Design a protein around this ligand. Structure first.
Ligand SMILES: O=C(CO)[C@@H](O)[C@H](O)[C@H](O)[C@H](O)COP(=O)(O)O
Ligand SMILES: O=C(CO)[C@@H](O)[C@H](O)[C@H](O)[C@H](O)COP(=O)(O)O
Lengths: 313, 310
C-alpha cells in the first residue's frame, strides 16, 4: 500500500487546493479549496471558463434590469465569486473559501455586511453556510468582524497572517481558521538578508512562523485550524506535514502527486488588546509591510475585475 | 549680500532641530524641536552632564514614593523638560517635546503623558503656550491631539509621510504638522539603488511637503506646515516659503555660510478612511512604523543611561 507524498499528506493534514480551477481540483481530490481575489481574476480572464463568466454576467444583467452600472457591477462581482465557489463545492466534500472585497479591510461593519451578502448568495443557490468560509484580511478590524460573524454561525478564514500576534488575536476571537503565510515571509527574509539561494528549512522564516503558531495553538488548547498558505516550493509544504491544514497551488499538488518517498510527519503573552496588537504588529517590519501589500494587491485585482465587468456590459 | 539663512527667515519660520541648546543661539531660530533621538544624542555627548545629574537628584528628592521603574520614567520626562527650559531661555518661540513613542497606539496614555509633560513645565514656571507636545501621527495620536487641543495644549504631529495623513491632522485642529522629507527621499533612493540624490523636481520628499502645503493653502487650514528631516541644504532651499522648516545645526551652518540668491518656491476623514489611505502608501506604512521603532530604541537607551546614573 505504498502511497504518493500527496496521498500520505492527506492522512496527517487537511489538504486544501489553492485555485479557482475546479477541473484541476478534481485530479487532486483535496478536502477544501480556497479562492482569493487574485485567483478569481485569473479564472475570469483565462479562456478555460470564459463561457461560465459570460453566462454569469448575462444572467445577472437579465435579472437586474433596474440597477445602475455601479450597483450592477458589484452584484456581478459577488455573483462571479460565488459561481466559482459553487463549481468548486460540486467537486469536493468540504468547504470553499470566498474573500470579501479587500476595500472593506479597515471597516468591521462593512466587512460583516459583505460577508452576509456572500452567504446569502450561496444560500439562494441551496448551499448551506456550513460549506463556506468567508475570507477576511487579518487586520484588527477584520478580526473584530470575524468575532461577530462567528457568533452568528458564519465561519471565517483569517488570511494575510504574518505575525504570531494576529494569529493569537484570531484564536482569542474564536475564528474557525487562520491562514499564516509562508512563502511571502521567506520572500522578505531573502530580500532583507541578501540571500542568493533559498534558505534551509530550519532557517526558513516562513516555515518557522507556521511552526510557532501551531505550537502556540496546541499549548493554549485553541481549536482554530492552522492552515499554512503561500508556498514557493514543495519542500516548504513537506516541512509542515502534520499541520492542521495546508492550502497548496495546483503546480505544487502535481509535484506532490509524483513524489513517492515516505512523508515524515513534522508537526504532531497576555490577552491581546487593540493597542497591544497594533504595537506588536508595528514591531514587525515584515508583517507591517506584507499585510498592507496583500490588501493592496487584492484591491488591484478586484478593481481590474470591475473594469472587465464594465467592458462586458 | 544676505546669507541664504537670513533670506529664508524672511519667508519661513526657521526652527532648530536639536537639543544642544548652546548651538541654537548662533542661528537665532524662532522655535526649536527636540525628539527622542536628539535628546539621546545630547545626553550621550555629555556636554550637559551637570543638568542630567541635577535633574536625577531633584526627581528622586521629590518622589520618595516611586519604585525604580517608575522613578526612571519620571526622570525621563524631567530630562525632556530640563532641556526644553534651557532652550526656551535662548529662543523667543516654542519648544517641541515628544511623548514616549511606546504609547503611539494608545490615545489615553498619549493624553496623560502629554499632560504630565505640560504639568512639569508649569511646575518649573514655563507656561504651556511656549510648548508643543510632539506625537506620532498614527490614528491614535491624532485622536489624542484632538482632545489635547480642545484643552489648550498645542501639538506637533510628527512622522507625517502621506497627504491624507496630514489632512486628518488638520481636521483635528492641530497646531502644527511635521511632514518628513529626507526619510521619503531615502525610500526613493533605496527602491532603485540610486547612488545620487534625485533632481529636486523629482525628489519625493520635497514633493510631499509641497503637496501638503498646497492642500492646506487651498483649503484654508490654519495648521502650520513644518518640513522636517533633511539630507542636504538643497532640499531645505527647495522648500523656501514653507510656513516653517526645522533644520539641523549642521544644515543651519551651511545656510548661514551660503550667500546666493534664495528663490522663494512656496507662496471628513474617518478612521476607516485614514487607515485605507495609509495602507495604499507603502512608503508611509513602512516609515511611520519604522519611526516609532527607532524613537523607541532611543528612549530605551536613554532609560538605560538614567538607570546607570541613579
Ligand atoms: O490564504 C489563502 C487561502 O486561505 C490563499 O488563497 C492565499 O491568498 C494564497 O495562498 C496567497 O495569496 C498566494 O501568495 P503567493 O504565494 O503567490 O505570494
Ligand atoms: O519632526 C521633527 C520636529 O518637529 C524632527 O525633530 C524630526 O523628528 C527629525 O527631523 C527627524 O527624525 C530626523 O530624521 P533623519 O533626517 O535623521 O532621518
Amino acid at each position: 500500500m505504498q502511497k504518493s507524498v500527496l496521498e500520505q499528506l492527506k492522512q496527517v493534514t487537511m489538504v486544501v487546493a489553492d485555485t479557482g480551477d475546479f477541473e484541476l481540483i478534481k485530479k487532486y481530490k483535496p478536502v477544501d479549496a480556497t479562492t482569493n481575489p487574485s485567483l478569481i481574476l485569473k479564472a475570469v480572464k483565462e479562456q478555460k471558463y470564459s463561457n461560465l463568466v459570460a453566462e454569469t454576467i448575462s444572467k445577472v444583467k437579465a435579472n437586474n434590469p433596474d440597477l445602475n452600472s455601479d450597483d450592477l457591477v458589484k452584484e456581478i462581482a459577488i455573483e462571479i465569486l460565488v459561481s466559482f465557489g459553487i463549481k468548486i463545492l460540486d467537486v469536493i466534500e468540504g468547504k470553499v473559501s470566498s474573500e470579501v472585497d479587500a476595500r472593506v479591510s479597515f471597516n468591521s461593519a462593512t466587512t460583516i455586511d459583505y460577508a452576509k451578502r456572500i452567504i446569502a448568495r450561496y444560500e439562494s443557490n441551496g448551499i448551506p453556510k456550513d460549506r463556506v468560509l468567508i475570507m477576511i484580511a487579518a487586520t484588527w478590524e477584520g478580526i473584530k468582524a470575524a468575532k461577530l460573524l462567528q457568533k452568528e454561525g458564519i465561519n471565517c478564514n483569517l488570511t494575510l497572517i504574518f505575525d504570531k500576534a494576529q494569529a493569537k488575536a484570531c484564536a482569542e476571537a474564536g475564528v474557525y481558521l487562520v491562514s499564516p503565510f509562508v512563502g511571502r515571509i521567506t520572500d522578505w527574509q531573502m530580500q532583507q538578508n541578501n540571500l542568493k539561494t533559498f534558505p534551509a528549512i530550519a532557517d526558513d522564516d516562513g516555515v518557522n512562523s507556521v511552526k510557532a503558531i501551531y505550537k502556540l495553538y496546541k499549548s493554549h488548547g485553541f481549536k482554530t485550524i492552522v492552515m499554512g498558505a503561500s508556498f514557493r516550493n514543495v519542500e516548504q509544504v513537506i516541512a509542515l506535514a502534520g499541520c492542521d491544514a495546508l492550502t497548496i497551488s495546483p503546480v505544487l499538488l502535481e509535484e506532490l502527486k509524483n513524489r513517492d518517498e515516505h512523508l515524515e510527519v513534522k508537526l504532531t503573552s497576555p490577552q491581546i488588546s487593540e493597542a497591544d496588537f497594533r504595537w506588536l504588529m508595528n514591531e514587525n517590519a515584515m508583517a507591517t509591510h506584507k499585510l498592507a501589500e496583500g490588501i493592496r494587491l487584492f484591491t488591484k485585482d478586484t478593481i481590474e475585475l470591475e473594469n472587465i465587468i464594465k467592458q462586458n456590459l
